[PDB]
Design a protein around this nucleic acid. Structure first.
Ligand SMILES: [Cl-]
Ligand SMILES: [Cl-]
Ligand SMILES: [K+]
Ligand SMILES: [Mg+2]
Ligand SMILES: [Mg+2]
Ligand SMILES: [Mg+2]
Ligand SMILES: [Mg+2]
Ligand SMILES: [Mg+2]
Ligand SMILES: [Mg+2]
Ligand SMILES: [Mg+2]
Ligand SMILES: [Mg+2]
Ligand SMILES: [Mg+2]
Ligand SMILES: [Mg+2]
Ligand SMILES: [Mg+2]
Ligand SMILES: [Mg+2]
Ligand SMILES: [Mg+2]
Ligand SMILES: [Mg+2]
Ligand SMILES: [Mg+2]
Ligand SMILES: [Mg+2]
Ligand SMILES: [Mg+2]
Ligand SMILES: [Mg+2]
Ligand SMILES: [Mg+2]
Ligand SMILES: [Mg+2]
Ligand SMILES: [Mg+2]
Ligand code: NA
Ligand code: NA
Ligand code: NA
Ligand code: NA
Ligand code: NA
Ligand code: NA
Ligand code: NA
Ligand code: NA
Ligand code: NA
Ligand code: NA
Ligand code: NA
Ligand code: NA
Ligand code: NA
Ligand code: NA
Ligand code: NA
Ligand code: NA
Ligand code: NA
Ligand code: NA
Ligand SMILES: [Sr+2]
Ligand SMILES: [Sr+2]
Ligand SMILES: [Sr+2]
Ligand SMILES: [Sr+2]
Ligand SMILES: [Sr+2]
Ligand SMILES: [Sr+2]
Ligand SMILES: [Sr+2]
Ligand SMILES: [Sr+2]
Ligand SMILES: [Sr+2]
Ligand SMILES: [Sr+2]
Ligand SMILES: [Sr+2]
Ligand SMILES: [Sr+2]
Ligand SMILES: [Sr+2]
Ligand SMILES: [Sr+2]
Ligand SMILES: [Sr+2]
Ligand SMILES: [Sr+2]
Ligand SMILES: [Sr+2]
Ligand SMILES: [Sr+2]
Ligand SMILES: [Sr+2]
Ligand SMILES: [Sr+2]
Ligand SMILES: [Sr+2]
Ligand SMILES: [Sr+2]
Ligand SMILES: [Sr+2]
Ligand SMILES: [Sr+2]
Ligand SMILES: [Sr+2]
Ligand SMILES: [Sr+2]
Ligand SMILES: [Sr+2]
Ligand SMILES: [Sr+2]
Ligand SMILES: [Sr+2]
Ligand SMILES: [Sr+2]
Ligand SMILES: [Sr+2]
Ligand SMILES: [Sr+2]
Lengths: 53, 337, 132
RNA sequence: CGUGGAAGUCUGUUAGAGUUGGUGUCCUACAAUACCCUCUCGUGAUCUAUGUGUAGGGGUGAAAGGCCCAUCGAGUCCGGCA
RNA sequence: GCGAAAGCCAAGGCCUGUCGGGAGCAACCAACGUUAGGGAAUUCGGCAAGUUAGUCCCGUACCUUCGGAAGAAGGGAUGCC
RNA sequence: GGUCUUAAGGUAGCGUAGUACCUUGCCGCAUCAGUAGCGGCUUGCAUGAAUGGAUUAACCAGAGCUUCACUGUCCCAACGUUGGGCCCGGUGAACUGUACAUUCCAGUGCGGAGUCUGGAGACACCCAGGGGGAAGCAAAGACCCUAUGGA
RNA sequence: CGAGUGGCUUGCUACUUCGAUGUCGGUUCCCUCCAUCCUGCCCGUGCAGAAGCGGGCAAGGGUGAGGUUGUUCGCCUAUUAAAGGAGGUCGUGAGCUGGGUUUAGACCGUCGUGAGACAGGUCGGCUGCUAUCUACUGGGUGUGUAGGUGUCUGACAAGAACGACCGUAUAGUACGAGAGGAACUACGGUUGGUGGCCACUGGUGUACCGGUUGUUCGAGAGAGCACGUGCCGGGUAGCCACGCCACACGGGGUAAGAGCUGAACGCAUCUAAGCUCGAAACCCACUUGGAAAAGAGACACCGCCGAGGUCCCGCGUACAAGACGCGGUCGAUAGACUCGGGGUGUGCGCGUCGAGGUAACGAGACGUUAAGCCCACGAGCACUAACAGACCAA
């Protein structure tokens, strides 16, 4: 599909889908960016992401 | 009372020493049912990628739904059945009676062989037929070999020679089928014996691990709790009881781990092809870019990239064949992420 | 049991504390057993998503505490795998107390549930709010 | 509330003294009692250098039969003694 | 920096806690780092390791010989310009 | 028993205790489950008043148990780091050695044999390993008894 | 009541060791016994079914996790198909542990005039050694069979390479008044074991990139030290499990058992001859090893004056030495260069904005700049280095 974080055109058969306290669903194209949200960082805030560039 | 526990590691693949021929040698060939045909082919492990298919299982509810499946890429360019060996049945099993060769050889077959200069095919052939006429012809196998040179990723040009059995038709019929193949140049492809969807038996020599301890080699526990600080960590409890006053060869011990022959069963051929369809971005790590003859074998395959893997129609199949599965997507995504 | 439809990695072991996601009055649950599980010498019997585990009420109402009740693991932290390789994990490992006939002991099911749990314990499914 | 600055007071690898655990390292050792981490005391019945006194059935001992030159339920040497 | 504390650096001293060379350097051992999920299930026993941690502020129970308990607990704060 | 020995005949308290044999005492607490720990009961095999009894704030590298927190202690192991370990130059010991000795399986024997009996097995040499055996090596057993021994 | 087998308890004996054969419990690791707890095939029933009760064959595999106690034992909990028992110097301390017993210190109860005692309790209290032989795990060198290469054979050897469970349909059916409630078969999954692999998830990653604290090189740039990364973040290749892949049926011969034909005994009889069937157990099947199998093997080709091999040189699909594999110009083997594929996260310098400040000064933001820096991978590229040549050999 597509990463619910950075915005990369996600590769089929490769990935992680995340549910939350609320119950939403945020996908991840990699734990590289997964661990960015653990650091409070945003996709737009972080230049290196498809969102911010 | 001390709970029960299965012994650490299997005793079947013993002794666990380095293999003699890095080139696998099947010790059991398929039964003679169909038409005359060679019973196996070979290639070279390239790497791994996944693929998406449409469920073939008529029993699974997933039947018709897409499904992501891992696959080992194996470049399987055309080999050359350079000869035909005959076996006579003697009171001491089978013994090579005689072989029949050719003229057209591969330009570099002499890198490993002492290529023939003066062979008498027609005569040798006679010997086989007179033996069949007598009712002593056992089974018919074809001395075969590969063109490593064809595969660029593989540095070796010096061909890998291995014999393969031919069966199917009646002794006579398959005998001729053999000669026919051989009486050309022996060139044949994987599609000359396989078809996507068929389960095969891939045999290979495992990855080289060198000497390793019991823990790694035989899967034995590490010292636990307080026992892991006194100066013992990956060493086992003991080598046996007081009596027998000896060390039984069944106790997990340090030794050569890896580089063993393994015959991995029921490997389904997910797709046979040719071209750069399975290659990866940047290239298969520590191998290279694929382009040409090959096979996408479902799951893992014994051995490291560049090693000669050998195929064979499944001697002990469990399910029924689902020829040509619908391969929707083959991953081209880089293997450096 | 009816094939889950996904490959898990039991995020919990025996004695592990999970949240009882429902309105039974039970807050904390202690995994005690795993219906249909026989381990091997020296191993913490592993409990995972989509397992009918025996459980003990750790925290809860005076009437509920110290009770040995059955439950179905609804959520867990360690990822599971779906047919398309994609992984899925939960904000927390939790379970729903179920009964003799495997029907929820409460009426409300707090938080999400897995679409794999549904298959097996549909009575729990036809109660689930969010089904991921 | 401030001043004052008491104490066999506190924290402390200040110097210094001690030595709980790892039953870790070592165990033909670096060492015939060692190394490392941890740990205790640390203005007092405190620690310490030098000088000096008590000597063997005797000293000395906040007492463990501890210590009195690697020797202690009675030192060490030589003699009785072959 | 509270400091005769740590860490860093002078003055000064030294490369003599005095054998070297080679192998991405295997097994195994000593020291040690990091380990997803779970979290004492380990063990005689949390042994080992870890957690906590400086300073300021709010706040602090039972009991008490009123001396103490007490840094109880608990909560917040913390850089730079 | 409703005094007798031998003077008196256990009082306050404390009590299944570092004392309680029975004993994992009964009850409760606590845990899924607690020979553990705490409380209570207590006839205490064989508690008890300076042979001090009870009580206790504070103190403790003292003994036992519970909770929160933490974690490779464990589930169940992985990868890494540094010094060894391995090959090479150089230096260069010691423990041990009646003899023979490629062993295994049984048997036998002072009843716990590489060496005897019968079988089986076994081409020689060398490298690394973890230590099953040599009732391995290291100490004329501390245990036990004996001696017209010692202190 | 009588007859026995065992050698696990206990007891008896005093043969064996006192110039020493290390204790209990535990742990780890391997082999075994069957008097079988489970799993397979069976007989009986107070056998409708279902769930049982008793018995037979059977040792393939399994027989798990926890609470108190040092416990062995045992008690208790929850799972299970079941959570069987015993032997191996009460297997295993030149393996570990050291909780109990059983030193030297000490307390309590008891006894004792006393020293002191205890087949009472309690706190504390140490674990040596560089492997000669032999044994087994793996790795080499030689001799034998008697030039070389490649391919085989298969006496023999190993395996548990598989074990078990749940669910679906069968079927709310057989059966039963009902309650309750199957099977054959075919399917899906789980668990334990097993061998292999790394596309994906996960861990590591003291390669690397980034933030940042202290201090030192004046500042800036850029750098060293802070344990063998200062700490924090991310982290590729690789290795890995917590990831992923694969692990029969069927045949053949029996056991217990069901039977067939059948006599001694005209009948009868599963047995005495003969025969059909029948266990997870046996053989086969499948995997592994295996010309040193002394009957020391087979086939094809090449060569005896030359086949081939060593050396050497460049390197890994190999690796503790040795071994192994590949390449060596008729070349892509390694390095440099350039792409590509990746890691980090936006360079130094400069411009602007910037809370302010008289000004000096200014943390910071922004642009230049998805920038700069980096890679254990792949491609292209013979530029560099695979050069030079030596030797053995029927
Ligand atoms: Cl161990
Ligand atoms: Cl359980
Ligand atoms: K003895
Ligand atoms: Mg990768
Ligand atoms: Mg990735
Ligand atoms: Mg255990
Ligand atoms: Mg003096
Ligand atoms: Mg963890
Ligand atoms: Mg335990
Ligand atoms: Mg500690
Ligand atoms: Mg009591
Ligand atoms: Mg003696
Ligand atoms: Mg004595
Ligand atoms: Mg005397
Ligand atoms: Mg001994
Ligand atoms: Mg029997
Ligand atoms: Mg058996
Ligand atoms: Mg004890
Ligand atoms: Mg023993
Ligand atoms: Mg031993
Ligand atoms: Mg010992
Ligand atoms: Mg004790
Ligand atoms: Mg004394
Ligand atoms: Mg030793
Ligand atoms: Na040690
Ligand atoms: Na022993
Ligand atoms: Na005052
Ligand atoms: Na110390
Ligand atoms: Na004297
Ligand atoms: Na008294
Ligand atoms: Na003190
Ligand atoms: Na660790
Ligand atoms: Na040994
Ligand atoms: Na004495
Ligand atoms: Na007997
Ligand atoms: Na023991
Ligand atoms: Na068995
Ligand atoms: Na127990
Ligand atoms: Na013994
Ligand atoms: Na022991
Ligand atoms: Na010891
Ligand atoms: Na059968
Ligand atoms: Sr073969
Ligand atoms: Sr074979
Ligand atoms: Sr130790
Ligand atoms: Sr013996
Ligand atoms: Sr003080
Ligand atoms: Sr200790
Ligand atoms: Sr040391
Ligand atoms: Sr010592
Ligand atoms: Sr330590
Ligand atoms: Sr102090
Ligand atoms: Sr002071
Ligand atoms: Sr004398
Ligand atoms: Sr200097
Ligand atoms: Sr020197
Ligand atoms: Sr890291
Ligand atoms: Sr505990
Ligand atoms: Sr425990
Ligand atoms: Sr605080
Ligand atoms: Sr009284
Ligand atoms: Sr050794
Ligand atoms: Sr049975
Ligand atoms: Sr016993
Ligand atoms: Sr008992
Ligand atoms: Sr045992
Ligand atoms: Sr002890
Ligand atoms: Sr005692
Ligand atoms: Sr000879
Ligand atoms: Sr059913
Ligand atoms: Sr019904
Ligand atoms: Sr450094
Ligand atoms: Sr019969
Ligand atoms: Sr031979």
């Amino acid at each position: 599909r597509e990463c619910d974080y950075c915005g990369t055109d996600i590769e089929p058969g490769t990935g992680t889908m995340f549910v939350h306290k609320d119950g939403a669903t945020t996908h991840f194209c990699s734990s590289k960016c997964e661990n960015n949200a653990d650091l409070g960082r945003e996709a737009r805030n972080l230049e290196w992401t498809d969102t911010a560039r | 009372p001390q709970p029960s526990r299965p012994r650490k590691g299997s005793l079947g693949f013993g002794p666990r020493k380095r293999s003699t021929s890095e080139t696998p040698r099947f010790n059991s060939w398929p039964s003679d049912d169909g038409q005359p045909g060679v019973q196996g082919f070979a290639g070279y492990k390239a790497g791994m990628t996944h693929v998406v298919l449409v469920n073939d299982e008529p029993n699974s509810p997933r039947e018709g739904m897409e499904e992501t499946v891992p696959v080992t890429v194996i470049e399987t360019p055309p080999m050359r059945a350079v000869a035909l060996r005959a076996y006579e049945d003697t009171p001491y099993g089978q013994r090579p009676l005689t072989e029949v060769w050719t003229d057209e050889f591969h330009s570099e077959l002499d890198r490993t062989l002492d290529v023939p200069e003066d062979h008498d095919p027609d005569a040798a052939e006679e010997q086989i037929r007179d033996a069949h006429e007598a009712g002593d012809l056992g089974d018919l196998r074809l001395i075969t070999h590969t063109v490593p040179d064809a595969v660029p990723s593989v540095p070796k040009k010096k061909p890998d020679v291995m014999e393969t059995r031919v069966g199917g038709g009646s002794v006579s019929d398959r005998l001729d089928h053999a000669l026919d193949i051989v009486e050309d140049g022996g060139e044949h492809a994987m599609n000359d014996i396989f078809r996507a969807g068929e389960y095969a038996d891939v045999a290979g020599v495992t990855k080289g691990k060198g000497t390793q301890g019991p823990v790694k080699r035989w899967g034995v526990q590490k010292r636990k709790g307080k026992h892991a600080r006194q100066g013992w960590r990956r060493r086992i409890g003991n080598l046996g009881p007081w009596n027998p006053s000896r060390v039984r060869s069944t106790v997990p011990q340090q030794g050569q781990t890896g580089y063993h022959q393994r015959t991995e069963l029921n490997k389904r051929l997910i797709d046979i092809g040719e071209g750069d369809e399975p290659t990866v971005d940047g290239g298969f790590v520590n191998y290279g870019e694929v382009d040409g003859p090959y096979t996408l074998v479902k799951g893992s395959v014994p051995g490291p990239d560049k090693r000669l893997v050998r195929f064979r129609p499944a001697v002990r199949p469990n399910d029924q064949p689902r020829l040509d599965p619908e391969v929707r997507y083959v991953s081209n995504e880089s293997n450096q992420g | 049991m009816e094939a889950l439809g996904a490959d898990v990695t039991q995020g919990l072991e025996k004695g592990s504390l999970i949240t009882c996601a429902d309105n039974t009055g039970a807050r904390e649950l202690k995994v005690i057993s795993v219906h249909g599980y026989s381990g091997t010498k020296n191993r913490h019997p592993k409990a995972g998503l989509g397992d009918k585990i025996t459980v003990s009420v750790t925290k809860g109402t005076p009437e509920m505490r110290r009770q040995v009740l059955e439950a179905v693991v609804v959520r867990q932290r360690k990822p599971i795998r779906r047919p398309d390789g994609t992984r899925v994990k939960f904000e927390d490992n939790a379970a729903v107390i179920v009964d003799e006939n495997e029907d929820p002991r409460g009426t409300e099911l707090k938080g999400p549930i897995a679409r794999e749990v549904a298959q097996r314990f549909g009575s729990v499914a036809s109660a689930a709010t969010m089904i991921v």
